[PDB]
Amino acid sequence: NLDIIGKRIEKIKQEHETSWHYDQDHPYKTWAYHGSYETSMVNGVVRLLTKPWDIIPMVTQMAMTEKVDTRTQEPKEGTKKLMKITAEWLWKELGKKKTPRMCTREEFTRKVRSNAALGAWKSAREAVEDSGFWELVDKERNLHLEGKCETCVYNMMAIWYMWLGARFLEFEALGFLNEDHWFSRENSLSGVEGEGLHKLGYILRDVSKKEGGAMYADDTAGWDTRITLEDLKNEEMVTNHMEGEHKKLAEAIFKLTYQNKVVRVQRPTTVMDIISRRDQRGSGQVVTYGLNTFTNMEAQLIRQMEGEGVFKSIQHLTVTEEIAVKNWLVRVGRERLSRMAISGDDCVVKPLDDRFASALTALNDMGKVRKDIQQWEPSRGWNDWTQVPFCSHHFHELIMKDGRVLVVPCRNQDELIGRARISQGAGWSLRETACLGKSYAQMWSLMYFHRRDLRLAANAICSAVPSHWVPTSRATHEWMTTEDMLTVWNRVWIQENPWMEDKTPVESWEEIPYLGKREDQWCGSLIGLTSRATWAKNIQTAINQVRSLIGNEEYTDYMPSMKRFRR
Ligand SMILES: COc1ccccc1-c1nnco1
Ligand SMILES: COc1ccccc1-c1nnco1
Ligand SMILES: [Cl-]
Numbered sequence: 001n002l003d004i005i006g007k008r009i010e011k012i013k014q015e016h017e018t019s020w021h022y023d024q025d026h027p028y029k030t031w032a033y034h035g036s037y038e039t040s041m042v043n044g045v046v047r048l049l050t051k052p053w054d055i056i057p058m059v060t061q062m063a064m065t066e067k068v069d070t071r072t073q074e075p076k077e078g079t080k081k082l083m084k085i086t087a088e089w090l091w092k093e094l095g096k097k098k099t100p101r102m103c104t105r106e107e108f109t110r111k112v113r114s115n116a117a118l119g120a121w122k123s124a125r126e127a128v129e130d131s132g133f134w135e136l137v138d139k140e141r142n143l144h145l146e147g148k149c150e151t152c153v154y155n156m157m158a159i160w161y162m163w164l165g166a167r168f169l170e171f172e173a174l175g176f177l178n179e180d181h182w183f184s185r186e187n188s189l190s191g192v193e194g195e196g197l198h199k200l201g202y203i204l205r206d207v208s209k210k211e212g213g214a215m216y217a218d219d220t221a222g223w224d225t226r227i228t229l230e231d232l233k234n235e236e237m238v239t240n241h242m243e244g245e246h247k248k249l250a251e252a253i254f255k256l257t258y259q260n261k262v263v264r265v266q267r268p269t270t271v272m273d274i275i276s277r278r279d280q281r282g283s284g285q286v287v288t289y290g291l292n293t294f295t296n297m298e299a300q301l302i303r304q305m306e307g308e309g310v311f312k313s314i315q316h317l318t319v320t321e322e323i324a325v326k327n328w329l330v331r332v333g334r335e336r337l338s339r340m341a342i343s344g345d346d347c348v349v350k351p352l353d354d355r356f357a358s359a360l361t362a363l364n365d366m367g368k369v370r371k372d373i374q375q376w377e378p379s380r381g382w383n384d385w386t387q388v389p390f391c392s393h394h395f396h397e398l399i400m401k402d403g404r405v406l407v408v409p410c411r412n413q414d415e416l417i418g419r420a421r422i423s424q425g426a427g428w429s430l431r432e433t434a435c436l437g438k439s440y441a442q443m444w445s446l447m448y449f450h451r452r453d454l455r456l457a458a459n460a461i462c463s464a465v466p467s468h469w470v471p472t473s474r475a476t477h478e479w480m481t482t483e484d485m486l487t488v489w490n491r492v493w494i495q496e497n498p499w500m501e502d503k504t505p506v507e508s509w510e511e512i513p514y515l516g517k518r519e520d521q522w523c524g525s526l527i528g529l530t531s532r533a534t535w536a537k538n539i540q541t542a543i544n545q546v547r548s549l550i551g552n553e554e555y556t557d558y559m560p561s562m563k564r565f566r567r
């Protein structure tokens with residue numbers, strides 16, 4: 001404990017030896033407390049082209065603006081045995097066609113020169129060019145090999161930002177989980193890593209085709225706060241598939257950063273509290289998505305075991321039950337994984353039958369308490385895959401004029417328009433703001449083409465931003481391109497779509513269908529309102545307002561792609 005965190009604490013104390021004090025009025029009960037020292041904007045391009053939404057509070061309010069300090073109990077021995085056996089088996093299946101390996105300074109740099117979230121000289125782009133930086137990384141690296149840590153400290157402020165060296169060492173040991181697609185559907189059977197929002201609907205419809213009960217989609221209440229040290233230890237078992245230096249490097253990240261956290265927090269009363277804890281996910285973990293998917297996969301298989309009566313009690317797992325659990329995993333494990341879609345803490349399960357709905361003992365004792373339902377109330381499942389929520393979306397089964405079947409993602413249009421009106425960060429030029437507006441417009445044309453208001457606004461934004469300006473943004477992002485959007489649509493929805501047998505390209509946007517008008521209004525369309533009919537009729541005037549602001553550039557008119565504007 002203090003042997004593992006003291007060095008980190010000792011170093012921070014010394015760097016602020018003039019302001020250190022063991023404050024007696026600290027709000028921490030479940031976080032160990034050590035001491036203290038002394039210490040959204042609106043996108044105008046999108047907003048000017050979505051004027052009807054200026055008076056919709058669900059849109060406008062999105063742009064305005066005690067669970068971490070909690071303690072989950074040690075699971076019963078029967079639960080701990082259920083997890084350990086499932087986790088050992090799960091790492092084995094994930095590793096059958098994948099090779100754990102170290103990630104490199106070289107591939108780590110290709111991310112810093114591509115402006116990706118690293119959780120980190122002025123910027124990360126500077127420090128990587130300097131060899132003095134890497135001389136410090138080696139200091140720490142060598143420390144980790146000697147079972148010690150000095151500078152890997154989390155900074156509470158959405159992400160816990162670290163010194164660039166700690167973000168590499170984490171990427172070095174565990175990045176393979178991310179970049180080698182361990183949670184791909186092909187590899188993990190439950191996962192959807194890299195699948196893309198145009199595949200999730202088809203994936204849920206394939207789960208629907210299985211024989212069984214309702215589809216269950218129970219959200220966990222603060223998943224990250226509910227991660228036990230037993231979960232963290234089952235996650236560490238990935239090191240059993242590793243070797244040499246990699247194994248030592250990964251074991252250290254697990255032992256010294258994950259299973260013992262050190263965090264520097266702000267407190268207005270403004271001191272920097274230095275707190276520590278062994279459990280929870282926290283933030284700061286670059287493989288949070290992957291390890292959440294892993295632990296959720298494990299929890300959901302055990303819940304499936306409980307519904308099938310593979311075991312009677314969580315209090316003590318009997319050895320006859322132990323072999324039965326192992327025999328279940330080996331004979332039907334893969335079949336039960338294929339009955340799920342799991343994205344981090346998010347899941348959809350189509351179990352063998354509806355006993356799953358009241359199989360709650362293991363799930364509650366693992367600490368994965370369901371959101372907004374009494375602890376022992378049975379889960380309410382969905383009878384129709386087109387109603388199940390997943391990754392903040394639902395999915396419509398749309399029919400093209402020619403009988404081919406699109407499965408399309410959808411959410412409340414107020415949520416889509418409200419997010420596109422927001423920019424994160426400072427120092428945006430007009431040109432940068434317009435290129436972000438164009439990324440949203442191209443995303444809408446690819447994913448939400450079936451919503452009347454989003455096709456029209458997306459065409460208006462692409463008409464209002466210079467044709468050749470590149471979309472920017474500080475799973476799959478096929479809208480991030482200057483290629484023609486009809487061509488990308490044909491690639492994504494027809495050519496590369498493994499659920500479409502007939503590969504005949506579409507030759508115009510008018511051959512690409514909308515939802516029914518009533519279904520469009522149900523999902524938030526303003527089609528039918530006077531404000532929307534004025535907006536639509538006078539759209540060239542809004543486009544010209546934004547063209548005048550940006551100035552004398554090469555623009556294309558995309559509105560004639562819509563039949564009504566086509567003269
Ligand atoms: C956005 O992801 C990251 C990228 C880099 C470093 C950390 C994270 C992270 N931490 N917790 C969740 O993510
Ligand atoms: C699979 O997710 C990632 C891929 C790449 C980089 C970071 C992440 C991540 N961040 N927090 C969780 O995962
Ligand atoms: Cl339903």
Ligand SMILES: [Zn+2]
Pocket residue numbers: 140144148149150151152166256
């Ligand atoms: Zn360290």
Ligand SMILES: [Zn+2]
Pocket residue numbers: 394396410411523
């Ligand atoms: Zn919808």
